[PDB]
């Protein structure tokens, strides 16, 4: 690893019992199956501008 | 805000206006629903609480659009080791009466983790600073929204970067210097209280909180910001609490 370009993580990171790595996201937000990728789950979600993803 | 633009509207949507009997007092960022990040300082000299309003979805101050939705604040929560008239801890948590209502001109900022805040955000070099406060020092303050992009730099590159004034405050643990030196661009005292926020991977965050400098755009200085990192664990545990009878709540620190 998470020190290390955020562990490839879009958003958190957990580091785990050894080369193990969890990425994690911010609630309204969910975990594609690539595992790092975080999508919303909301209509707003938090830290994204409607106007500009509209566009 | 020195030497910004005007933010398109709808650009800045966690963006709060602090009003008091509906003068305006400080900015604020929308985290969630119902709660605000503002500067500890902004509530220095309140004594009538109940004429303490927050407002989402403003734009222009000279015009009501619609867009703008008001609240009543009916929680400030200040650290413990915040002192009035002082700099170090300047950060306020904010509970509204009632939700605001999420909308294209209405979203909340991300409150990021304290590791990825750290290890991740601390290091993206620039960052939005944004308010209606003065256009310049010793000027008027702004009717419309403006919006700065802002560096950041390091606490020993602050300090060496810097004009040595008397009796100045102490950069502390719980700040971070963002800006030029100069006399260009700055986040001025009306801005208060408002976000500084980064973006990272088609998401903003909230990193800093406009709280403090040696006038604006002054040359040899840079804004001094809450390093918000500082207190993520102090914020979820609030926001996690039953609210408490009474508008100031002072809450433990650490
Ligand atoms: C903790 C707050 O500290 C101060 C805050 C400001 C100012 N905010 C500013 C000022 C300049 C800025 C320049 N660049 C970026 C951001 C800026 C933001 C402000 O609030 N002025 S005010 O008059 O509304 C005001 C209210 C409560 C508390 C204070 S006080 N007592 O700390 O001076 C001042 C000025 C001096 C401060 O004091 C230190 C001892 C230099
Ligand atoms: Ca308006």
């Given at each position: ?55 | 805000?020195v ?176 800006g030029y030196?100069?006399?260009?661009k700055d986040s001025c ?24 400098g040696?006038?604006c755009a ?5 804004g ?31």
């Open positions: 690893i998470c020190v290390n370009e955020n562990g490839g993580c879009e958003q958190y990171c957990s580091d785990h019992t050894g080369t193990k790595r969890s990425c994690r996201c911010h609630e309204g937000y969910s975990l594609l199956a690539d595992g790092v990728s975080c999508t919303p789950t909301v209509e707003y979600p938090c830290g994204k501008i409607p106007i500009l993803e509209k566009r | 805000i030497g910004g633009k005007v933010c398109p509207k709808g650009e800045c949507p966690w963006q709060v206006l602090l009003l008091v009997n509906g003068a305006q007092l400080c900015g604020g960022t929308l985290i969630n629903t119902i709660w605000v990040v503002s500067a500890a300082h902004c509530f220095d000299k309140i004594k009538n609480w109940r004429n303490l309003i927050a407002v989402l979805g403003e734009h222009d101050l000279s015009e009501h659009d619609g867009d703008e939705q008001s609240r009543r604040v009916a929680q400030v929560i200040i650290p413990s080791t915040y002192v009035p008239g002082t700099t170090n801890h300047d950060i306020a948590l904010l509970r509204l009466h009632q939700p605001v209502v999420l909308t294209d001109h209405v979203v909340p900022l991300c409150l990021p983790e304290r590791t990825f805040s750290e290890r991740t955000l601390a290091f993206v070099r620039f960052s939005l600073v944004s308010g209606w406060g003065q256009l310049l020092d010793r000027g008027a303050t702004a009717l419309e929204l403006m919006v700065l992009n802002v560096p950041r730099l390091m606490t020993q590159d602050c300090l060496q970067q810097s004009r040595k004034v008397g009796d100045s405050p102490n950069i502390t643990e719980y700040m971070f210097c963002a030196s100069d006399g260009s005292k009306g801005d208060s209280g408002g976000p500084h926020a980064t973006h990272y991977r088609g998401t903003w965050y909230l990193t800093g909180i406009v709280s403090w040696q006038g002054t040359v040899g200085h840079f001094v910001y809450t390093r918000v990192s500082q207190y993520i664990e102090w914020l979820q545990k609030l926001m996690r609490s039953e609210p408490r009878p009474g508008v100031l709540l002072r809450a433990p620190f650490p």
